[PDB]
A paper describes a structure:
In these mechanisms, the effectiveness of inactivation depends upon Fc gamma receptors (FcγRs) expressed at the surface of effector cells and the interaction of the extracellular domain of the FcγR with the Fc portion of the antibody bound to its cognate epitope. In contrast to humans, macaques only have one low affinity FcγRIII receptor, CD16, which shares a polymorphism at position 158 with human FcγRIIIa with Ile158 and Val158 variants. Similar to human low affinity FcγR receptors, the macaque FcγRIII receptor consists of two immunoglobulin-like domains packed against one another at a roughly 80-90 degree angle in a comma- or apostrophe-like shape. The Mm FcγRIII forms an asymmetric complex with macaque IgG1 Fc with the Fc binding near the bend in the comma-shaped receptor; the majority of the receptor’s contact residues to the Fc reside on the C-terminal second immunoglobulin-like (d2) domain closer to the cell membrane.
We also determined the high-resolution structure of the Mm FcγRIII(Ile158) variant alone (apo), not complexed with Fc. In structural studies, we used receptor variants in which glycosylation sites at Asn38 and Asn169 (two of the five total) were removed by mutagenesis to aid in crystallization. The apo macaque FcγRIII(Ile158) receptor, expressed as Val158 variant, was crystallized in orthorhombic space group P212121 with cell dimensions a = 49.1 Å, b = 67.0 Å, and c = 69.7 Å. Crystals diffracted to 1.9 Å resolution with one receptor in the asymmetric unit. The model was refined to an R/Rfree of 0.182/0.218. While one well-ordered glycan can be seen attached to Asn45 in the apo macaque receptor structure, no glycan is visible linked to Asn162 due to disorder. In addition, there is a hydrogen bond between the Asn45 linked glycan mannose on domain 1 and Glu166 on domain 2 which is only visible in the apo receptor structure due to its higher resolution and better resolved glycan density. This added hydrogen bond may provide an explanation for the detrimental effect of removing this glycan on expression. Receptor crystals were grown from 25% PEG 3350 and 0.1 M HEPES pH 7.0.
Numbering used by the authors: 4 to 174
């Protein structure tokens, strides 16, 4: 039993819109004579041989679980990627947080189209407003931060909203 390799998302958002870029990175030990990495998507080997797997323009079928293995590691745990269709997407680095952790939320527009007059909502109520698009940080989460979140804004002069994301805070 060798240590597990680990997959990381860069940037950290596990939910992305179609046409976003995503890099999966593998961390694991290599034997000197074998510097190659094996990648899996949906439990099937894929064609990347490098420690980074780059998705230049995400599509719905890039969704699923990824795993990787290096020559001196065991197969990593799966990391899930969700590719969504929409004009707006509420992004988070995960959906489960422990009390007192920081929560970084982002209202992301398709193709980074310019967005303004952004509201973040929790449980159907306005929670934070920004005249200009800005991320939303909860520096120290409490049980009061559990709920259904979404965001809304103006693209040009049309209102758009994102779908909701459940965020759960644990003890
Ligand atoms: C690896 O495994 C993973 C599984 O883990 C697999 O991922 C699945 O891949 C399949 C195949 O592509 C996916 O199925 C497709 O989903 C397409 C997108 O569906 C979402 O978006 C729809 C459109 O979005 C709306 O977005 C906003 C709304 O807020 C707004 O812009 C509009 O309303 C716009 O319409 C949306 O309608 C759809 O909602 C339905 O489905 C969800 C559940 O997914 C349900 O909750 C809703 O109530 C509603 O029923 C969904 O949110 C979808 O477009 C596509 O369907 C059309 O295209 C196919 C083309 O093949 C047609 O055949 C089909 O008849 C439709 O015309 C299809 O359904 C599936 O969702 C993935 N599963 C996930 C992500 O968990 C990967 O493919 C695997 N990869 C590999 C390489 O093996
Ligand atoms: C890596 C990748 O792109 N996989 C799928 C491909 O298997 C499928 O044929 C195509 C059809 O939309 O969608 C995508």
């Amino acid at each position: 039993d060798l240590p597990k390799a680990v997959v990381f998302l860069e940037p950290q958002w596990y939910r992305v819109l179609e046409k976003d870029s995503v890099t999966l990175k593998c961390q694991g030990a290599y034997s000197p004579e074998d510097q190659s990495t094996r990648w899996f998507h949906n439990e099937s080997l894929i064609s990347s041989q490098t420690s980074s797997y780059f998705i230049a323009a995400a599509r719905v079928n890039n969704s699923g679980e990824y795993r990787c293995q290096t020559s001196l590691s065991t197969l990593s745990d799966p990391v899930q990627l969700e590719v969504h269709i929409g004009w707006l997407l509420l992004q988070a680095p995960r959906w489960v947080f422990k009390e007192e952790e920081s929560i970084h939320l982002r209202c992301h527009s398709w193709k980074n189209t310019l967005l303004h007059k952004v509201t973040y909502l929790q449980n159907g109520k306005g929670r934070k407003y920004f005249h200009q698009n800005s991320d939303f940080y909860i520096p120290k989460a409490t049980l009061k931060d559990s709920g259904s979140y979404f965001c809304r804004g103006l693209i040009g002069s049309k209102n758009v909203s994102s779908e909701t994301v459940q965020i759960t805070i644990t003890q």
